[PDB]
Structure formats: structure tokens, C-alpha cells
Amino acid sequence: AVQNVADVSVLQKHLRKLVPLLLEDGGEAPAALEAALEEKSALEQMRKFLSDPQVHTVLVERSTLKEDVGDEGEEEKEFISYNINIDIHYGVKSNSLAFIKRTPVIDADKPVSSQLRVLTLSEDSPYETLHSFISNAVAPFFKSYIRESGKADRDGDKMAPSVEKKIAELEMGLL
Amino acid sequence: AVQNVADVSVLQKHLRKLVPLLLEDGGEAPAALEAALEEKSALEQMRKFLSDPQVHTVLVERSTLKEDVGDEGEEEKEFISYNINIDIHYGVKSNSLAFIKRTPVIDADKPVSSQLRVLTLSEDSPYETLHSFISNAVAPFFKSYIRESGKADRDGDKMAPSVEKKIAELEMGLLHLQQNIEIPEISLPIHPMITNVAKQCYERGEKPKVTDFGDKVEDPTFLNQLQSGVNRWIREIQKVTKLDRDPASGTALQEISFWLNLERALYRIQEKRESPEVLLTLDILKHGKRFHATVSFDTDTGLKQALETVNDYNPLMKDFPLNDLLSATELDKIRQALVAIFTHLRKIRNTKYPIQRALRLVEAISRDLSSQLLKVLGTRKLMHVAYEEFEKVMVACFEVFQTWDDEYEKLQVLLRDIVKRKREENLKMVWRINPAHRKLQARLDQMRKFRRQHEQLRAVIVRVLRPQVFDAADANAIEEVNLAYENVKEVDGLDVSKEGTEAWEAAMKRYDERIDRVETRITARLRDQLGTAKNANEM
């Protein structure tokens, strides 16, 4: 929703201070993040994402580009870059951070970081990526909540055991 | 793989920088985090996490503890309480940060954040969250991965498209996500001091006044705290107000429960905010001209329009025949309730309701029928149901289904009436609906057929298979018809699996094989007995 909306500056600065801690494991914002700040297409797409409640998903793809080389027998160097993504895409040799509004309504007064839900992805293998992550994400948490919340004692939705079977077959197929 | 074990300090600093923004839009690594964060209880836990190439889950939370304080003056005191866990579960009144090692042992020399993925926890509705977020995170990503990897190009492995299909099964299979949590009301999430002061000023029975609050009646900090609490309460009631189960993916029982739940909740909240505490709070905040809170509360009700949306009570008019149906165990009562509920549906016309939602509810009714009538027929025990009684009960059930079909047709007429109404606004008018029971009825009707033929196959054996009424072929064929009848009788019954009908069809094509053996025998006896003349026993 749109009653109060966080500014481009504050959100982008938060992202600038946040990303290097992740895609550099505690590094500092590089020139790629500078371009991300200056990227007008990104500058508008993030405004659309923050404003529009139709889509609550956004993606930033710190991309590695095959930089040409002129060295003496040394293969081509890798150059860190940036990409903005309203949708999500199969990143290749390009690390990614996903931000989807945990709180669908958008408010500047509301903690935007606590208004957003954070995921990330480094390109090693999508198969094990999805499998292991959903496994150690929904196997313990979902089962714990359903068992301990008394829902296992509630017949209102026998939907939970069915989707437990669904989760199990998900993990089987993905592994 | 297994590599160097990381140290506490590096990841500790990383998470310390990451948390405070994610938790409360700042905080800059609060010491409450660091107290038990540095504690040996968490320290050995995380040493095991980094070292053991088998554990890949951890849950660091920080509950804003609702510390109940018994001292007079207020109700509760806001508190901070960092929490360490190695397993993940729904933290109550708190959001958490999970961390999954992508490498079974993680080191600092390679980027830790590269070898481990971050999850962050939702306390509002963790299930709806995880569902929607996993969907929006993997399904488009997985589709893009399939397209770029060319999984359709190499058909040697076709399991990735199937896992895409099962991901779709997950996402569109459950949307309710155990919806309709029956939250009818909550406590008062506002300033505690004003509440306790008004409580003590009214328990005396002397009408809590403007002045008894002292300067707090005009204190800017006190009034701002009142506004913040009122805004918290109004946001909570808006959140619970905007809730609406999707008509699909549920059931008519779910819809009626949803309707009644929202009805009683809106009643209790339309009777709750009128408590004198709320009234005096608003009055004394407006005393300092805190008009923003007043206009917000005036406009952020969000329930009025919902109240007229529920002001239709033909809902209950259909609900009662639904209850009769749920209690229905016999076909006559079943389509009696069908007639009544359809009449009430025709009576919904004067009321306002989402048309697509109404259609989805009709489909929910249709397959709820399918289910309960399946239960009824299984009760009838068609497994070895006798011939004539099978025909009788099937005629009954099939004419009840024809009554349902007439109800369906008149419902289409009502849909045309609904389109006539739609002429007032002219939105989408896509119409498509199909109860599964038809397929069920499919099997039903085809079973009637064999029953017919089998009857015809009995007396004629005494007539045509009997020698002019040979004995050896007669005996063989009567034995075969009896045994084939037995096998086809006990092969399937109330069984409603269509593949069960197919197996039955194999059994009856074998039946017809014996029958054609009989046809050959009887035609052979025919022709070898022919040639005499036309009259009677000759032709």
C-alpha cells in the first residue's frame, strides 16, 4: 500500500551499507555498488517496487563480467558489476540478493528492513541450492510449528499433513 | 566440503552489523544481543555449527519481551531479550535470522556469506510468508534456470519439468496456508499508564476526568505515546480486517466458518473500541489537538465497507441447507437440501457479493457433494450389491443426480441473471465450472449396463443353452457364466477409481469372450439344426 513511502535515498543507502557485508563477506561498497546507486533504470525500478504493491519482489544481481585481458598469457580477468531485476532470473556467474516485502504494505515509518524479507543466492548449483535450502528451511520450522501450535490437534485444516508429504517429495526430487 | 573452521569474531561482527537494521530499522549491534551472543552457551553451539559438517541450521532471535510488571502505574514494560537456538521454530512476538551453511564446514578465508545463505523470520504469519516467498523466489528462478539450461533440449532427464510441476502443486495447492486463524480480538496495545490511571479513576466510580491525568493530558510525549499505541491498535485491526480467505482452495465449510468468524469478530470489535478507556484516550489526545490520530481512527476503521459486504445474510440461508447436507445420509434428504439451498441461492440475488467468489463457492459445494455422496454410496456397500437392488439404488442416486443437474441448469439461468446484473458494471464474465462427480457418475452409469445384459444372460441359458428346451457344452457354459458373473461381481463395487472401472472393463471383456464362445456354440447348434423348413422348430 501507499500512505507513507520510504525514500530512494534511505533505502538505497541501507542497501549500500548492507550488500558489501554479504557479497564481500564484510567488504566495502565497490564501484559496482556506485553504479547501482547511479543506475537510473535501477533508480526507477526500485521506486516501482517500493511503490507498487502489485509486486513485492525485487532482485539485485551483483554480476561478474568477463573483462577482456591484454596480459602476457593470462586468461581474461573478471570484473564485478551490478544488475537490477524487478523479476528474478537465473543468474549465472552473477551473485544475487532478493528482497521481497514481508509486510506487503509499504511505510517509511515502518522499519523497511523489518518491512522486507531477505534472501540471497551465490551461483554454485541451483539443484543443491534449492534442495538444501528448502530442506533446512521448512523441514524443521514447519514441522515444529505444526506440532507445537496445537494444529496437530486441530482438524480444521488437514491440509498440513498433505503439504508435509508434498514437502517430502519436493526434497526427494530436488536431491 | 570440510575446510578450516571459522572464528567467532568475524561472523559475530558480520551478524552484529546485519541485525539491528533488519530488526528495528537500526540499533547498531545492541549489547543485549552481544551479551548472550558472546555467551559460551551460544559460543560452543556455533563452534559445533562451524565445525560439524552435519548441522546447517541456526536461529538467532531477539524477542521484544512483553515483560508484565505488577507495579501500579502501568500494565507492561517493553523489554529486549536476545535468544539463541540451533534449531528453527516459530519465535513468538519476535523475528529471527536463520543461517544455512551451503558448505558443510565454513571458513573465513573464503567469504562466509558466500558459503552460507541467510534466512530471516516472519512472526506475523510465518507459513503464508514462507509459502509466498519460496514461490516468488524459486518458481520464476527455476523456470529461468530450466529455460537457460535447456532442460527441454535434453529429454534424457525429464524430472526437472516434473519437479517444476510439483513446485506448482505446492504453490497453487495450498493458498489458505491454514488460513482463517480465528483471531477474534486482542488486548489493548496502547500506552499503559493512561489505561491504569483511567482504571483507577473509574473503579472509584467518579467518572475519570480531564485533570486526573495531570500534565499528561497535555504532555506532548504522553499524547504521542497515546497516538503510537492507537496507531498500533488500528494497524492490527486493519490487518485482521483485510483478511479474506480465497473462495477456491478451501471448502464450503471453510467459507461458512470464515463468514461467521468475521461476523462475530466485527461484532466484538464494534463493541470493543467503545470501551471508556479508548474514548477518554482519544478525547485527551485531541485535547492537545492530536488530530492525525483522530482522523486516522475515523478513516482507518476499514470495517464499515466490510460490514455492508457482510450485511447480506442469504449466506446463512444457504448455510443451513449445507448443514442439512452434511448431516444428510440419504438421497431424498440430499436433494431436498439441494432444492432448498438452490432456492436460497436464487434469493441471494438481491444481495451484493463477489460473483467469481460465488462461482467458486458453488464449485466447492459441487465437489463437497461429490465427497459426501461418495461416502453415502460407500455406505450403501455396492461391492457385492445384488442385481435388482443395485439397479434400484442406482436409479435413485441417478435421478437425484438428475435433480442436481436441473439445479445446475437453473443455476446457469441464475448466472445469466447475474450477467444481467453485471450489465450495471461490466467486468469480466468468464464462466467455467465442473464438479468431479460426473466422472463418478460416469462409472455409475456404465455399471448399470452390464447389469442389464447379465439379467438377459440368465433365463436364456435355461432357454437357449439348454438342449432344445448338447449337454456337455451346456454344462461348460453355465459353469463359465456363473464363475464369470462371480468374478465380475466381486471384482469391483463402490470402488470409485476410474482405473478400477478400467480393470472392470477388462474383466467384462473377458466376460464377453466367454459370451462369444456361447454365441459360437449357439449359432453352431442353430446351423447344424437348420435346413429343415421355415416352420417353428425348424427355423
From Swiss-Prot, chain A:
Modified residues (Phosphoserine): S51
Record function comment: Cytoplasmic dynein 1 acts as a motor for the intracellular retrograde motility of vesicles and organelles along microtubules. Dynein has ATPase activity; the force-producing power stroke is thought to occur on release of ADP. Plays a role in mitotic spindle assembly and metaphase plate congression.
Coiled coil: 162-175
Known disease link: Charcot-Marie-Tooth disease, axonal, type 2O: An axonal form of Charcot-Marie-Tooth disease, a disorder of the peripheral nervous system, characterized by progressive weakness and atrophy, initially of the peroneal muscles and later of the distal muscles of the arms. Charcot-Marie-Tooth disease is classified in two main groups on the basis of electrophysiologic properties and histopathology: primary peripheral demyelinating neuropathies (designated CMT1 when they are dominantly inherited) and primary peripheral axonal neuropathies (CMT2). Cortical dysplasia, complex, with other brain malformations 13: An autosomal dominant disorder characterized by global developmental delay with impaired intellectual development. Some patients show signs of peripheral neuropathy, such as abnormal gait and hyporeflexia. CDCBM13 is associated with variable neuronal migration defects resulting in cortical malformations.
Full-sequence range covered: 20 to 194 of 4646
Family: Belongs to the dynein heavy chain family.
Subcellular location field: Cytoplasm, Cytoskeleton
Domain notes: Dynein heavy chains probably consist of an N-terminal stem (which binds cargo and interacts with other dynein components), and the head or motor domain. The motor contains six tandemly-linked AAA domains in the head, which form a ring. A stalk-like structure (formed by two of the coiled coil domains) protrudes between AAA 4 and AAA 5 and terminates in a microtubule-binding site. A seventh domain may also contribute to this ring; it is not clear whether the N-terminus or the C-terminus forms this extra domain.
Protein name (database record): Cytoplasmic dynein 1 heavy chain 1
Subunit structure and binding partners: Homodimer. The cytoplasmic dynein 1 complex consists of two catalytic heavy chains (HCs) and a number of non-catalytic subunits presented by intermediate chains (ICs), light intermediate chains (LICs) and light chains (LCs); the composition seems to vary in respect to the IC, LIC and LC composition. The heavy chain homodimer serves as a scaffold for the probable homodimeric assembly of the respective non-catalytic subunits. The ICs and LICs bind directly to the HC dimer and dynein LCs assemble on the IC dimer. Interacts with DYNC1LI1; DYNC1LI1 and DYNC1LI2 bind mutually exclusive to DYNC1H1.
